[PDB]
Design a protein around this nucleic acid. Structure first.
Lengths: 132, 66, 342
RNA sequence: GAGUCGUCUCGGGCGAGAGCCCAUAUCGACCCCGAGGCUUGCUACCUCGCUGUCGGCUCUUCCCAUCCUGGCCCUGCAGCAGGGGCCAAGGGUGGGGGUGUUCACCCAUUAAAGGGGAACGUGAGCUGGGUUUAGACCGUCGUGAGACAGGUCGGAUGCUAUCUACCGGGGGUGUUGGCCGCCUGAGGGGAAGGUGCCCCUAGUACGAGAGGAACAGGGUGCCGCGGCCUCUGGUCUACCGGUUGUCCUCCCGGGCAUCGCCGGGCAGCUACGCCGCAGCCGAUAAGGCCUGAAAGCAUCUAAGGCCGAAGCGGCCCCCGAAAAUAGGCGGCCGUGGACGAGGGCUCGGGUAGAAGACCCGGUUGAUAGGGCGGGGAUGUAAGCGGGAAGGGUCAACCGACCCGCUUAGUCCGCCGCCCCUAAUCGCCCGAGGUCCUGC
RNA sequence: GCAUGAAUGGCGUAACGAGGUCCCCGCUGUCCCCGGCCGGGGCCCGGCGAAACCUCUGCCUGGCGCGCAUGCCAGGGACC
RNA sequence: CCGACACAGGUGCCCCUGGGUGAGAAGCCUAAGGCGUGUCGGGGGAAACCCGGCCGAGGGAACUCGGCAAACUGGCCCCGUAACUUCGGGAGAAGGGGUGCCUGCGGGUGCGUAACCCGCAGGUCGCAGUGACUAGGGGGGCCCGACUGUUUAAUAAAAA
RNA sequence: UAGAAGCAGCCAUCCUUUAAAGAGUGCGUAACAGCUCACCCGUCGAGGUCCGGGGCCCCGAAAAUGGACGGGGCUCAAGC
């Protein structure tokens, strides 16, 4: 985790398909679960933004796919609430594959990426083409 | 911060701590006043073409006047 | 399942849910027993509005913008109509004696003399006796009443008790005494920037379901007969039904205490005097949905307040301070709003 | 199910033996003795004028021989990290893939993904997948009909709650003659809190180095619970607009296709929204000890004494005069066939609301309705003027459509003003200072 | 091959199927996690009117007992 | 009529020339014609919950024996179509595109411009032209029985 | 064996002399040295330490609606 500095909205459970925005050769990643989450009876693990997610690669090359990888989820289709009463909402849901350290796999992340993520892991903001 | 803002779908005066910012895949941002304004952009309608848009009307009437 | 531990749905920390025995809030914590001034100040909830403030408490770090909803309440001036003396017995606290002091008096359903002047003078003399001794008396509390007459929701006085603290019994008696002949202020008891508790009887839904009261998770692939039913209630032995199980019955019209809402602002009017910080005295145009004219002393307090719109709410000072946040004396209001609820 | 405890599960005692050496840092045979009812089996006690099976689902209680969190001790404990032991049910203990599956296997997360009883909990709650009937095939066996703890396909889940339970709501008496308002706190309940991460500590202590802790302070997340809609999202058969078919000759204005369909959306209700949910102390466990004997010494105990758990209470949140110790205070009242204090029914509305109740107003009045203005929803109206592809006997004009009039019109569950209208009119039920005693 | 086999038909098969099994894509409130709306009911009132079944009761906890009790026995709650 | 019954049942023929509609003896709307005895009503912010039924963000079966149930396509016209093949078929595979209204023409039938049918061009509005109603989701692999038919009227429509 | 010098280990474990001495109990050293015990005399000026039967009471001792000695309650007894 880290410092998120946003009021939470989550609404991506297990089985979700998210786009891979970094060059890596994996076209789709599917979320298994959310890292550092405590789940309860009848409640699928829900994912916000900024989270370190454990995932499998659902589509890609055979060298990327049936691999269990970690990623950090940059964007989500769902609306996000800032602390200041202004809301963030991106046209799609995306994740970038990321090593557990915080350091991104791919040599460029394209589009905006969430500010809450930037705070939490520096290298993802540093690489980013823009931080919205 | 003390921010103030202005809708980019009508030009109408617009309150802060209210509305949604819809952020492009490229990163640009568009300020929507209310749910109607957002719903209407998706439709691809011309708020100008219609008369529910108060500032758009207004301009045209004035442009008439000159 | 496979012995899958499942956390309880509903609570016993708040149960039972039922109708309040009086529309006067209940108190079992007293934060002004040994400390001067009343236990806050009572008004009627006007509505809510929202305001943008600057940290204050660090969202991330200090100096950043934060959104906060605020509940704007028309308070009446309150006025002491009764002095209560206690003597401590040996089964609890028992009532020594009282002074009762007088068209609103007429609208009240409460009993009236019929030899006002006489009865009052005897109770008053009785009290001076009790005050002298002085250790008979171990505490003194005040019967205090609302005065609605510019406020249209109700025009009868709702009558309640608030304690009046003081260091010792003689001091509480002097203070209470001065007060009967007088009005009172939002300004006098309370100040901005403390954290205060809020007490109220919440909005009545009427009878509501297991779905609504306790929460009932949905079920399997297809269900012919419903998904909003009770399921199991229990085994063959126990031979009797419990109370920890989902049922339908009353939700609302229950007294609730919610703690620690920060006092943002105090003024009077509204919308007849315009200030650029500490709120612009936020009054919506077209008025508030389902609530009477505003024009009297007011307070706009943070966050949520128990009680929906058009209901008598009461305020109490806190029984705890914040515990990993600092108090801020006098909140800061970066920019304002003037929105409609329409 | 009861009985039973061989079988099963678990414990205790003795300590062969290896662990370089050293039985107990750790592992632990032979043998011997208990506990539990959780596997299996035995019993034929209970039911054949029925006590319906298994699994899942949903919903809840209890237990500890405790998976995690708290507090503790050792070590063959350098650190990091293990191993082993003690207290402890307050809280938590998840989601997926196969199997009908309890159970079991697997994946990645997790602080941990604990087990067992409750009619192998839970079918007058669901489901009916599995055991499984009357239909059929195949394998095996049989002269044959026909059989299978072989495989397999398909094969009903009844009932308006009489009693009683629990959750919510009324009507009355007792209430020490009745009564109106305000309180007391007997007790009852609770998890209102649980949990994790990150930074600072610290690249430190510690280590040859590799590597790498802790106390304490900030920020954030998650789960549970409760409340709340001003923001944002849902809905909205208030309303408004667009539009197909058809009917009214018909422009206008409407019906129906069971809101015709589609588009927008206020109030209100909701989350996929927002906000809130302590500390400390006392007494204690396990433990660490002081003084200090039995045993002139030594010794944490034999007596006396000091600390010390997420557990226990207060503190905290929920309910609570029918608590019979039936409570307290203040005021009001009485005193078929005299008189009549409180109270309801009535009316106009709800903060309220299944019936009822609750609450407020009732001309001393803004309570509701009209009218008017204000605020909001839709989005450009009736009608009229000009244009319009073309067509014309070249005119009256026939014309989908366009623009102006018109930010108009239609509409409102919201606000103010205003006694204009309706809050009129009236009905009743309840006493008779009470038998003695205190007075 | 526990325990296949040639008209007590074997192997295969285009086309066909309210046949059994499995997988995918689209789609979707089946689910995470629930909410609002519509019509018929519910609830109340007038009139019309059954049935199942019926020794009796305001119970709870244990013990006992034909070993799975309101009534026995000892506790505990209790205004209608 | 018949079902004890005024039991939503279930039994033959003709009306197959009603209009709009359109391929229809179709749907829906509206007639002729029939009825309001499809024989109980009135009331209530009308709560809970149930039976029909509508809409739901983000996700896309995580639910479950099983996508069961619902969703979805859709009418019509053109284009285009794979594995396999008994050359018939598979096939509406799969998958793409257009469709309203007004204004001016052409072909076809006729009779002299009357009565009709089928296309073209220009103008043009909306979020949407099968706009309502009507109205198939698609693909492959394996097993069985070839097929169409039949079976436990009334739990079993099948590999029988 | 460099050292084994009581003290890596193996075996022996003898003799003289006495507040007192074991070819040495433990520490310690690479092995010694060094620290120290059993042991003794004497002061404290006493009855001293033991071992072994018995009776009892404690430990051993973990369970699922509140169940236990019939209940309450009872510790110089209302116990044995």
């Amino acid at each position: 985790r880290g410092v998120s500095a946003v009021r939470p909205t989550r609404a991506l459970p297990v089985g979700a398909y998210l786009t891979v925005a970094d060059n890596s050769g994996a076209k789709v990643i599917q979320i298994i679960g959310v890292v550092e989450y405590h789940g309860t009876r009848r409640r699928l693990a829900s994912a916000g933004v900024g989270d370190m997610v454990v995932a499998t690669v659902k589509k890609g090359r055979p060298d990327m796919r049936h691999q269990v990888v970690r990623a950090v989820i940059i964007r989500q289709r769902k609306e996000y609430r800032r602390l200041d009463g202004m809301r963030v909402k991106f046209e799609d849901n995306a994740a970038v594959i990321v090593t557990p350290e915080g350091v991104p796999r791919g040599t460029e992340i394209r589009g905006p990426v969430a500010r809450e993520a930037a705070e939490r892991w520096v290298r993802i903001g540093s690489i980013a083409s823009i931080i919205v | 911060m003390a921010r103030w803002n202005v809708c980019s779908y009508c030009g109408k005066p617009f309150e802060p701590g209210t509305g949604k910012m819809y952020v492009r895949n490229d990163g640009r941002v568009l300020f929507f006043c209310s749910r109607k304004c957002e719903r209407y952009y998706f439709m691809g309608r011309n708020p100008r073409k219609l008369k529910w848009t108060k500032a758009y009307q207004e301009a045209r009437l004035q442009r008439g006047g000159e | 399942m496979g012995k899958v531990h499942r956390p309880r749905r509903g609570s016993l920390g708040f149960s039972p849910r039922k109708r309040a025995k009086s529309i006067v809030p209940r108190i079992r914590s007293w934060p002004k027993e040994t400390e001067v001034r009343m236990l806050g100040f009572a008004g009627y909830k006007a509505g809510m509005t929202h305001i943008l403030m600057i940290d204050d408490e660090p969202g991330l770090t200090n100096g950043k913008e934060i959104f906060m909803p605020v509940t704007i309440i028309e308070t009446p001036p309150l006025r002491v109509f009764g002095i209560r003396a206690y003597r401590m017995g040996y089964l609890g606290l028992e009532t020594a004696t009282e002074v009762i002091v007088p068209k609103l008096l007429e609208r009240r359903i409460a009993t009236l003399p019929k030899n006002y002047t006489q009865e009052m003078f005897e109770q008053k003399l009785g009290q001076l006796e009790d005050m002298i001794k002085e250790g008979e008396i171990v505490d003194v509390r005040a019967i205090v009443a609302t005065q609605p007459w510019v406020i249209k929701l109700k025009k009868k006085p709702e009558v309640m008790e608030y304690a009046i603290g003081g260091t010792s019994v003689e001091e509480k008696f002097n203070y209470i005494k001065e007060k009967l002949g007088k009005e009172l202020r939002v300004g006098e008891v309370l100040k901005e920037g403390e954290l205060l508790d809020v007490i109220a009887v919440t909005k009545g839904k009427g009878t509501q379901g297991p779905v609504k009261r306790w929460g009932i998770k949905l079920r399997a692939h297809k269900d012919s007969k419903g998904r909003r039913k009770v399921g199991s209630i229990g085994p063959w032995h126990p031979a009797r039904v419990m109370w920890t199980v989902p049922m339908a019955g009353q939700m609302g019209f229950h007294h609730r205490t919610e703690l620690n809402k920060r006092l943002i602002a105090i003024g009077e009017n509204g919308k007849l005097k315009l200030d650029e910080n500490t709120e612009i005295e936020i009054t919506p145009k077209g008025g508030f949905p389902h609530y009477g004219i505003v024009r009297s002393d007011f307070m706009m307090i943070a966050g949520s307040v128990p009680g929906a719109i058009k209901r008598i709410i009461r305020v109490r000072p806190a029984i705890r301070p914040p515990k990993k946040k600092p108090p801020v004396q006098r909140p800061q209001i970066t920019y304002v709003s003037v929105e409609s609820k329409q």
